[PDB]
Design a protein around this ligand. Structure first.
Ligand SMILES: Nc1ncnc2c1ncn2[C@@H]1O[C@H](COP(=O)(O)OP(=O)(O)O)[C@@H](O)[C@H]1O
Ligand SMILES: Nc1ncnc2c1ncn2[C@@H]1O[C@H](COP(=O)(O)OP(=O)(O)O)[C@@H](O)[C@H]1O
Ligand SMILES: Nc1ncnc2c1ncn2[C@@H]1O[C@H](COP(=O)(O)OP(=O)(O)O)[C@@H](O)[C@H]1O
Ligand SMILES: Nc1ncnc2c1ncn2[C@@H]1O[C@H](COP(=O)(O)OP(=O)(O)O)[C@@H](O)[C@H]1O
Ligand SMILES: [Mg+2]
Ligand SMILES: [Mg+2]
Ligand SMILES: [Mg+2]
Ligand SMILES: [Mg+2]
Lengths: 370, 187, 316, 370, 370
């Protein structure tokens, strides 16, 4: 069996090809102690990673090696990969071929360096680097559709027709779950709650995951939340203190539809999705509109598929159906589709093998992978 | 062997004397001390040695003497002391040069073993002679290098910072059964 | 140390002593340096007069690239006839020194800096000729491609500065390119050196250091050096290329850039050594972790109470 | 083995590492005669120390060399340390390492002169200075908690999470059992009884140690004592005359909860503990609330743990379990935890050694004991 | 004539539009007596404000109704505004429109209560609530700049280009002169000086602003202080006791560059200034680097402009001039800027008039002010 990893910008999803769900899902985080250990014989470690960094976060500064789908810290990424292999899956990396995964329109250096580290540091037998949105069609059982994938670091559109991608119509938006956590920390300040530290950011991420939703019509929802407390909810901090939340409960996710809330000049997720369909050839658009696939954690908000169908129906011509397939497992659909792909008998000649890498160098990945 | 001048390092308990064969003095004479700190890890790069370590106690570095009572007892600190001796002060490439090292007559088999692996695997020197230290001090006693001025029989009393040892040498041979050591010296 | 000094530290400290000293003693001191370089420092006729002489296997190549002109410009009236077995020499008279401690200090620095001054002439030849090509290309931008193509062969410097390194460099109207045809012959340094040379080139692809010279690497040679005599494409050399652009040798920055590029392979060699001391501390930390897994096989027994010297104690 | 010397403000507590309790426990006092020494011979001395001063006190001026945790008189502190080693433990200090202690936020010079006298007067082979509240946490069997330690001269709060101290959240309060003794002298004067001398200050310290206690609700206890004989009880002086007291039994300890009774402008020990928890990072607060550790003789009052729990429960949010850990041995927890620490094998590498002091001078303590 | 009142966390600055300095500068403090008022007559009051509280402080518990730029005590803040209008400016607030100020990223309730109190209790005819660092740019005479403002409670960076603020690039740090004063109380304890009453905090505040300075290279000044007497200076307490102080003169202000000195996870003021420029659009950064405007009392240290210029030159690319702009009057520049804005002939349409408050209520302020 192959390994498959979505090295996501916020969570690692790792496991074996042919299994139904990731074996290991954990924070894509390394934490380091900020205070001095006064107590002798304690289990003091130089750094912590994943769920152990998340558990100990009150004494750690927390860093993510991936920002916007780009590996910005290679040492902390190597710590995360070492943790995936030896601690989480607890298999030696030399034994199984590994399907890694990436966002489209990344730096070419990100994929080469990821390839060089797997073959020369972890000594893997073979590996591949798939596009996250292509895997989301494999999980959905499609060969035609436009995938809106939105994780922690990047949002992207990939249109595919009958197994052919249209790489000129691919869209990237460096706005996803982390930018919505940053913005929820900022708009929590105006109700008087201060979240500042790297650990308080993880509490605000949990507030966003538990309470936020997408409002089907933002100005009617803003008028509703100004009229009564009925839209308000409460969250209890690890301190046992309670915070109450109101219009900032849906004004946070609206940054996906209104990127100007975080000050960036770009189209919202509905307009980048429509612009991706309108960059495609005219005969395929009619089938892309019926096959909008949603994937990744930032597509998990209550009401987002209803908002997304409403907005795409207003942009598209009214003479044809808009359908959006946002399945309940879509949080793991990139990994599920990678497990399907790495399990196909017709895929087993598509791996980059170690013997084929060390006659070509890490640029082999640009001609074996999309 | 290479035609480059051998490098001489007498690492004493108090002082290290560093230089090249055939000079009229050591190039450096400074304390056998290391100043060490007490998101990439670099605290093993941050150390200092010798006169430049004495300047660092006010900057919060812990000073230590890796040689005490004549014997090396901290091989982390002695490896860092030698790399800084070779690459800062002597400013030399070990692959081009043969080295003369020293230690007391008593010194453990373990110390010469640990010395050889640091010299041949860490630094990769071309070759190493670990000398019997006060036997060299007999040869420094000559009035000149010419064979007619040599006195190959004599007792040598060596007393440095850490240990004093009395060595009988006759016709150039060390009478090892007759070595005496007193564990008391300049410190 | 994270970075190597550019100057010979012994010559700097010795001259800083003797330029201050009330009563100079004689000296006779051969002193090694990196890249097979050697100095002789001595008082050959009076304790009052110090002769400093440099021996360097590539000095005949360096003279072809304008080295004597630069050494006469730097050392001036102190230049002396070469000593036997040495390529260059300078005589400093301790009664003839500058009138200030700061002029004395920068003279002691200038004489300690002599290995990087003899080796700087091909870089100054490239920087000054790039300024001619820059002015001609500013005159006619459509003639510039032919000036760069001819300067890539007619204005190329190669220095075989040690038997396992060739530094090759040339001007073009907007740059100086320098290629280190580079090797480690010691097998553990060749193995660690592959990691150092790989991570060196990948560092330049990250956002934080885009301000640096462009770097490229291979292990065949860069196209414009493939037919330089003594470059060889199968002979275990890697080829580190630096493209210095006009911003890397601006007048505020030329001498630091020259000093810092010459020490490239010396910092890499030094850090390949210092990495072993790091690996050894990484190892013995987890020897101390494995101790705790064996200590759980020791059955628990109270030891008798002992004083600091280990003598038995009779209380409690 | 090593000596552990908890040289506190009011009692010296001393013994050996690995012993169940201190085997030397005596007043931190030097006494000197205040009267005409008329009989020649008679076994007279120039000064007296500890229990010898406490038993002769009717003819002695008594003074403590240590006040508010700071050595004010080094000549008498050497006299006390000599009494610990040669009279009370009966040891050569040159044969034994010594673990010393002090309160946090002390003058730097206190640590320096304390290391200097240990190496240069007592010729010790090795020594260390521990923070008293960090020692008290080992005696709890805990590696996280907030320790409220109150001795004779100082009260302090130190929060520790998983062996990391949070030094910004450490609180000191220069109010403890000597301030409560002085206040008991001031209020005993209102019922008819004047205690004035340094010898009479030891009688009223003994009254405080067995008559006084903490009320669960001060205004109800104050009203119950104002309207009944039931809170009143008595004590017999050395002179055989009897003292009766009532609300003085709980008014004295209430100064820990209401420092304004002695003219101080500070939070009480309950609110100072809460302010220390609230200075810590938000994720650690839950485990600090569940681990409030009491220490030192000023925590030995009846009812103080029940009061401390009542008061912190009103300050913290009701959504979590406040727990106060008040062992019956908390009279000695700093010493107990020093005997744990001094017996651990990593601690054998943490000592300042004689050779290392001789090379560095007394400043070595600031760069080795934290 | 309009009034301008800059509600600082530590000082009120107040006066009239078109004047070149504030008429009233006084402590943002209310004091109440904490001792027995035994003497009838003799001019006593139940409470004291500003300079009266500062002069009588030995007998008072002082407190500030502002914490980190937020009003935490509204009844005391009414007493400060009443003192400002009736005692210190000597005006009827019903006759003059008032320009007020606050920090960015404040609670919306702060601005609502501040507009409500001003109309509904002071009967002000019209009022406005400006961002403090937007006013500091008016005083500097500029349309573009990044303003570092640091007062008593907050440090904030707001970048402005051609009169447009970048609200997403605004940085806030709840660390300024109160936190530096409390950290100086902390580290004065290690020299042996105890300052603990809120009146003693005002003595340490005065030690801070007469003796402290910013070290251009901190680790070299630490080495210089460890090896010299020349660093040390002396201060006269109100008692006529003389304290002497050394490395604590530059360790206190270095907390702005190293917030971990007080246990904060935040980046230093140089890093937050650079992070704020790097959140701006790439075309405006050149003019922000050349216009780093400094304001507020925590920017008044000797050598702070030089350390700020050194540190931002180490973050930025070397090809453009970093200019720190540090006016000699920069301690008042927010108030100077309010005097300009309230005097501008274009501003009189921007006031909230009581006629707007009478129909909209206090929520009017969020749509009239930035
Ligand atoms: N239920 C949810 N509702 C809203 N946001 C979510 C939800 N679950 C996860 N997220 C966001 O999505 C991120 C993880 O999604 P994922 O698809 O795994 O991203 P990635 O692949 O980049 O790691 C989280 O860190 C959080 O920002
Ligand atoms: N003039 C002197 N008189 C006495 N002792 C001296 C004198 N000069 C140096 N020393 C002492 O000699 C010792 C150093 O001698 P050295 O031979 O260098 O020792 P080592 O080799 O063991 O390090 C030190 O204790 C030093 O203080
Ligand atoms: N049972 C008790 N009840 C009240 N106070 C007590 C009790 N036992 C001791 N104390 C007081 O505690 C103080 C001594 O406590 P200790 O922890 O030994 O202080 P220290 O370490 O600072 O010397 C004295 O003020 C003493 O009177
Ligand atoms: N010269 C100075 N040097 C250092 N700190 C100062 C100086 N003058 C005032 N401060 C500090 O700055 C603050 C007062 O400045 P100010 O700008 O008026 O703050 P605010 O507006 O927020 O009240 C106080 O915390 C004070 O301690
Ligand atoms: Mg993903
Ligand atoms: Mg010796
Ligand atoms: Mg005590
Ligand atoms: Mg202010």
């Amino acid at each position: 069996t192959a390994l498959v990893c979505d090295n996501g910008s916020g969570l690692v999803k790792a496991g074996f090809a042919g299994d139904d769900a990731p074996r290991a899902v954990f924070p894509s985080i390394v934490g380091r102690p900020r205070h001095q250990g006064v107590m002798v014989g304690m289990g003091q470690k130089d750094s912590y990673v994943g769920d152990e960094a998340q558990s100990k976060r009150g004494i750690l500064t927390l860093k993510y090696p991936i920002e916007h789908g780009i590996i910005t810290n290679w040492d902390d990424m190597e710590k995360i990969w070492h943790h995936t292999f030896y601690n989480e899956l607890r298999v030696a990396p030399e034994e199984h071929p590994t399907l890694l995964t990436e966002a489209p329109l990344n730096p070419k250096a990100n994929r080469e360096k990821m390839t060089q580290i797997m073959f020369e540091t972890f000594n893997v037998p073979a590996m591949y680097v798939a596009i996250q949105a292509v895997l989301s069609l494999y999980a959905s059982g499609r060969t035609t559709g436009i995938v809106l994938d939105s994780g922690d670091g990047v949002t992207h559109n990939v249109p595919i027709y009958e197994g052919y991608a249209l790489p000129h119509a691919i869209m990237r938006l460096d706005l996803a779950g982390r930018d919505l956590t940053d913005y929820l920390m900022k708009i929590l300040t105006e109700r008087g709650y201060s979240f500042v530290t790297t650990a308080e950011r993880e509490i605000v991420r949990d507030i966003k995951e538990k309470l936020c939703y997408v409002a089907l019509d933002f100005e009617n929802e803003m008028a509703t939340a100004a009229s009564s407390s009925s839209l308000e909810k409460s969250y209890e901090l690890p301190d046992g203190q309670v915070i109450t939340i109101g219009n900032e409960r849906f004004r946070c996710p609206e940054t996906l539809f209104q990127p100007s809330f975080i000050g960036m000049e770009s189209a919202g997720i509905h307009e980048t999705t429509y612009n991706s369909i309108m960059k495609c050839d005219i005969d395929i658009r009619k089938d892309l509109y019926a096959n909008n696939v949603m994937s990744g954690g930032t597509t998990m908000y209550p009401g987002i598929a209803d908002r997304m169908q409403k907005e795409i129906t207003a942009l598209a011509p009214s003479t044809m159906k808009i359908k959006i397939i946002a399945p309940p497992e879509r949080k793991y659909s990139v990994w599920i589709g990678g497990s399907i792909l790495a399990s196909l008998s017709t895929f087993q000649q598509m791996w980059i093998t170690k013997q084929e890498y060390d006659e070509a160098g890490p640029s082999i990945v640009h001609r074996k992978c999309f | 062997a290479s035609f480059n001048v051998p490098i001489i390092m007498d690492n004493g308990t108090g002082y290290s004397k560093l230089g090249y064969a055939g000079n009229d003095a050591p190039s450096y004479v400074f304390p056998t001390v290391i100043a060490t700190r007490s998101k990439r890890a670099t605290e093993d790069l941050d150390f200092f040695i010798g006169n430049d370590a004495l300047k660092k106690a006010s900057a919060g570095y812990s000073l230590d003497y890796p040689i005490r009572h004549g014997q090396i007892e901290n091989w982390d600190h002695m490896e860092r002391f030698w790399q800084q001796s070779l690459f800062k002060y002597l400013r030399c490439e070990p692959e081009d040069h043969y080295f003369l090292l020293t230690e007391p007559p008593l010194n453990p088999p373990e110390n010469r073993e640990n010395t050889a692996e640091i010299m041949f695997e860490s630094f990769n020197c071309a070759g190493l002679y670990i000398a019997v230290q006060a036997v060299l001090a007999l040869a420094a006693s000559w009035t000149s290098s010419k064979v007619t001025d040599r006195s190959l029989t004599g007792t040598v009393v060596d007393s440095g910072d850490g240990v004093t040892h009395i060595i009988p040498v006759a016709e150039g041979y060390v009478i090892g059964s007759s070595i005496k050591t007193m564990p008391l010296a300049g410190r | 140390m994270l970075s190597l000094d550019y100057n010979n530290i012994f010559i700097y400290e010795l001259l800083t002593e003797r330029f201050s000293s009330e009563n100079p003693s004689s000296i006779d001191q051969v002193v090694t340096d990196f890249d097979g370089v050697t100095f002789h420092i001595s008082t050959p006729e009076e304790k009052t007069k110090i002769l400093i002489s440099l021996s360097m296997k590539c000095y005949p190549e360096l003279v072809n690239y304008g080295t004597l002109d630069l050494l006469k410009q730097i050392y001036g009236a102190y230049v002396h006839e070469p000593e036997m077995g040495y390529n260059f020499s300078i005589l400093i008279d301790l009664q003839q020194l500058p009138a200030t401690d700061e002029e004395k200090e920068q003279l002691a620095m200038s004489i300690s800096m002599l290995k990087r001054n003899v080796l700087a002439a091909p870089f100054h030849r490239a920087f000054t000729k790039q300024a001619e090509l820059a002015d001609l290309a500013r005159k006619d931008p459509e003639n510039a491609p032919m000036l760069d193509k001819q300067a890539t062969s007619q204005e190329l410097m190669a220095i075989h500065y040690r038997d396992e390194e060739t530094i090759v460099l040339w001007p073009e109207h907007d740059r100086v390119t320098v290629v280190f045809s580079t090797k480690f012959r010691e097998e553990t340094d060749r193995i660690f050196g592959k990691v150092f040379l790989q991570e060196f080139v990948d560092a330049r692809r990250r956002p934080a250091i885009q301000t640096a010279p462009q770097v490229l690497f291979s292990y065949d040679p860069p196209l414009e050096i493939r037919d330089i005599q003594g470059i060889q494409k199968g002979d275990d050399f890697g080829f580190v290329t630096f493209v210095l652009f006009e911003r890397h040798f601006t007048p505020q920055n030329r001498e630091d850039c020259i000093s810092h590029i010459q020490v490239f392979r010396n910092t890499l060699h030094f850090h390949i050594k210092a990495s072993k001391a790091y690996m050894h501390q990484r190892m013995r930390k987890r020897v101390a972790d494995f101790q705790k897994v064996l200590n759980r096989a020791k059955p628990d027994v109270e030891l008798e109470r002992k004083t600091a010297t280990g003598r038995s104690f009779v209380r409690a």
